[PDB]
Design a protein around this ligand. Structure first.
Ligand SMILES: Cc1ccncc1NC(=O)Cc1cccc(O[C@@H]2CC(=O)N2)c1
Ligand SMILES: Cc1ccncc1NC(=O)Cc1cccc(O[C@@H]2CC(=O)N2)c1
Lengths: 304, 304
């Protein structure tokens, strides 16, 4: 028992972190096979970031201008190319520590672990969620660009995020490993504001199931609701509308606890309308939305 | 910017996790050099756990009865000994992945990362704190025993915890790597209740400094207090008494923000007396006490 914001073990990803330097800028790169992936803004100066023409900036750059270092050893760069907002540096050595991997573009509401790195060295690991407004609420400082987000299935690492920028609001934006930004963000030091950050309803419900499984049951009530009635409440509180697909994914948790999905929705509804009244749920004084129904099942069953 | 409950990268510790089986019981072991450390209750049956005589139970056990497996390969056990509540299984092969390491017994209020394992395989990593009542609020299921807690300084892993048991209250108890339990707990399936869980005041203050550094300043007020006055409030709210040693450790955070420690104490005092009034601090609706002043400096400076 107990329930924690748990990240995947990061070892398979630590073995892929390298340092990429271009001119005066140093950031993190991801070394998989003979390719090093990193944010394309590694080629920019602080002046360039105001209105960068990446195709023009890359013309003035040769293979020898990209310094790639894995630990204390230098990798020889034999090719370079831009794919959307990432640079792919072909090195002459395949990474011997490359795990089984995939590049996956995640959906909003899905969770992932981040291995924050500086100068190609890992500093920490934490669990994140892709917000419905396509930002992530991470912990990143200058030098953290190129840090990756990922999920692990047995021995396969699914890379889903690469950190590129911090918005003036302190929230984070980045790309998938094909260099496509999540959301409308661009790699330019220009005014970019995030949209409305809605709450991931299906994740809050999954966390309510985790709370019941772990002993915190005070919020269970004698009521039920319908999807349409629940969604009227969800709209008023900037919660994502709950669909039958969401109800379906909550099925294993509903079966385990014996609490119908719509009954748990009625508990959520009263929690939204009345608040916690000074109480906590799984040591939290607010409704947690960064555990998917998969994370709850995984944590409560011990999938390694 | 941003502030997250961040754990250390777990790779150096993943390379040490093995599976230890004795009779019908399987738990996790820590393989460092030619020694595998694991909880001594691996030798017990469910009936034995009621009143186990570990010295007598160990008499009926030989080197060949301890099955140690690292991944898919079996380790040959050439020695076994009991040190307090841990067994030390001498194997004939030094772990090639052994990092630089120390065994350290941590103080209450100090934080550490846990790598939860099942069958010698890592499932997740999370950040914990040794509670003032010597329990930890972790996430552990049956099979997780032998999972370790640790800190990393550059390339040195300081092992500080080994998971042994879950109390009927859902909180966790365990030992340092010399087999000495933190707190009064014993490895026996008997009635054991934890003492009063007090709040780690110096950590709450350090987290208030992290909030100021990250933009959340609403809680800053026009007041100050004294150590004695603050401690009268801290006592009423089951908070650890703040000492001059605590004020001293908060010095770098006080210097960085320009907010005197006693001024931050007055903010904490009003927060304790009036609550959050529906507001949040670093995305939390309660006062967080699982970040030491060292964790705040580390996270806000990017120590890798
Ligand atoms: C310093 C830091 C800290 C944490 N995480 C990342 C960074 N770095 C950056 O943000 C550099 C950068 C890269 C692309 C675009 C860009 O402009 C953004 C877009 C907007 O509003 N400001 C800036
Ligand atoms: C099942 C599980 C889940 C999570 N973490 C650990 C476990 N395992 C245990 O707890 C086994 C065990 C080992 C020592 C003592 C012991 O009795 C405790 C003492 C008390 O009150 N109950 C039990």
């Amino acid at each position: 028992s107990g329930f924690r914001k748990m990240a995947f073990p990061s070892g398979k990803v630590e073995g892929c972190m390298v340092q990429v330097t271009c001119g005066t800028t140093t950031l993190n790169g991801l070394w998989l096979d003979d390719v090093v992936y990193c944010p394309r803004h590694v080629i920019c100066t602080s002046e360039d970031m105001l209105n960068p023409n990446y195709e023009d900036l890359l013309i003035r750059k040769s293979n020898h201008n990209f310094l790639v270092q894995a630990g204390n050893v230098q990798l020889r760069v034999i090719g370079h190319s831009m794919q959307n907002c990432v640079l792919k540096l072909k090195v002459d050595t395949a990474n011997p520590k490359t795990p089984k991997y995939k590049f996956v573009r995640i959906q909003p509401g899905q969770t992932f672990s981040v291995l924050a790195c500086y100068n190609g060295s890992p500093s920490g690991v934490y669990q994140c969620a892709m917000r419905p407004n396509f930002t992530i609420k991470g912990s990143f400082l200058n030098g953290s660009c190129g840090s990756v987000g990922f999920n692990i299935d047995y021995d396969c690492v699914s890379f889903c995020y690469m950190h590129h920028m911090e918005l003036p609001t302190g929230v984070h934006a980045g790309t998938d490993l094909e260099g496509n930004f999540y959301g409308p963000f661009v790699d330019r030091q220009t005014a970019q504001a995030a949209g409305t950050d809605t709450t991931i309803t299906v994740n809050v419900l999954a966390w309510l199931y985790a709370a019941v499984i772990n002993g915190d049951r005070w919020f269970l009530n004698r009521f039920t609701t319908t999807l349409n009635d629940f969604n009227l409440v969800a709209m008023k509180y900037n919660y994502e509308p709950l669909t039958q697909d969401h109800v379906d994914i909550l099925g294993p948790l509903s079966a385990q606890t014996g609490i119908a999905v719509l009954d748990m929705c009625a508990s959520l509804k009263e929690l939204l309308q009345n608040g916690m009244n000074g109480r906590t749920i799984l040591g939290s004084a607010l409704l947690e939305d960064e555990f998917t129904p998969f994370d709850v099942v995984r944590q409560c069953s011990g999938v390694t």
